[model samples]
Target chain A: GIVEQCCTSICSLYQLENYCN
Target chain B: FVNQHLCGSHLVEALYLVCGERGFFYTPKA
Candidate 1:
């Protein structure tokens, strides 16, 4: 699902790279 | 800092309008 894949991208855009893990 | 849990859920909800189950918590079952 793009939920994980796409969300991770958005997450990165949000500066959520570390916490999103 | 942000309330990390709530923030992730908020983000997911915008995507699906029904979130809280996924790769991150508050947005999960994660």
Candidate 2:
């Protein structure tokens, strides 16, 4: 699956806004 | 006027998966 595994994962990391704030 | 991949590729997204008896596409049987 293309699900984000963690905050630093590809999917999560890609969504920079979702990670920073 | 030509094809331009979204973010990097161009393709309208559509998912059609064959759900098994378990009822999941990624990981349901497990």
Candidate 3:
């Protein structure tokens, strides 16, 4: 349930956040 | 810019999750 910052190696750098499934 | 957001802390993890999880992956969709 909640949309948080996504990643890779957690995927480089951090950015905006949003709502998703 | 960075690559698309997949899941937790691992691309491979996201791959498996998306390929076979998704609905149950519990992570953001690519």
Candidate 4:
């Protein structure tokens, strides 16, 4: 499930990007 | 060279998820 893990982490980054802006 | 290559793959996969998911675009932007 590496892909799933990667997607979760990527989603986190997207969240952080929105949080800063 | 070895460490650099490994680091590159890590980012590449992350990029794939970001671009691959349509949900990412619809979410929201600053």
Candidate 5:
């Protein structure tokens, strides 16, 4: 349940780090 | 500047929790 919230929030930005790199 | 640092810390904390689920450690190089 907690992980689900992160996927939509910070994890989204963490994933986006790949694109900027 | 204060607000930016506060937000960044929260984001880092959030990533740490998320990474823990995947068995990885989140270390901020910033």
Candidate 6:
């Protein structure tokens, strides 16, 4: 079993984008 | 959830669309 979890919460996305940007 | 872009956004839809998108495995009542 393989689980690909994405923390799609606004907090997560915001942080991901913020760091990526 | 804040409006990095928000308002009941798709960001809130917690789901599990299972179709073996990436080498996934499941047991069938073994």
- In lDDT terms, which candidate is top? 3
Please identify model 4 stretches exceeding 4 Å from their true place.
A1-21, B1-6, B21-30
lDDT of 3 by residue, B1-30 (tens): 334665445544544444453323343554
* Candidate 3 segments whose C-alpha is farther than 4 A from its true place: A1-21, B1-9, B21-30
Better of 1 and 2 by lDDT: 1
What is each predicted model's overall lDDT from 0 to 1? 0.38, 0.22, 0.39, 0.35, 0.38, 0.26
What does candidate 3's lDDT look like per residue over A1-21, in tens digits? 223445433333223222212
The interface root-mean-square deviations, each candidate in sequence, come to 10.4, 14.3, 9.1, 11.6, 11.0, 11.7
Q: Model 4, B17: alpha-carbon shift in Å? A: 0.8
Q: How well is each residue in A1-21 modelled by candidate 5, as lDDT tens digits?
A: 223333333345435232231
In candidate 2, which residue ranges exceed 4 Å CA deviation?
A1-14, B1-30
DockQ each = 0.11, 0.04, 0.23, 0.08, 0.07, 0.11
Better structure of 4 and 6 per DockQ: 6
lDDT of 3 at A9: 30
Looking at model 3, the pairs that clash are A7-A10, A7-A11, A8-A11
Pairs that collide in candidate 5 are none
**Residue-wise C-alpha lDDT for candidate 6, range B1-30, written one tens digit per residue:** 323332232322311122223322232122
Note the residue pairs that clash in candidate 2. B5-B9, B5-B10, B6-B9
- Cα error, candidate 2, residue B14 (Å): 29
Candidates' chain A TM-scores: 0.20, 0.20, 0.14, 0.29, 0.25, 0.28
Clash totals, every prediction:
0, 3, 3, 0, 0, 0
Once fitted onto the true fold, the runs of candidate 5 whose alpha carbons sit more than 4 angstroms away are A1-21, B1-6, B21-30
How good is the docking of model 1, as DockQ?
Answer: 0.11
Candidate 1: segments with Cα more than 4 A from true spot: A1-21, B1-6, B18-30
Arranged by DockQ, best first: 3, 1, 6, 4, 5, 2
Candidate achieving the largest DockQ: 3
Q: Give lDDT for model 5.
A: 0.38
Could you give candidate 1's per-residue lDDT for residues B1-30 as a string of tens digits?
Answer: 222333355555543332223343333334
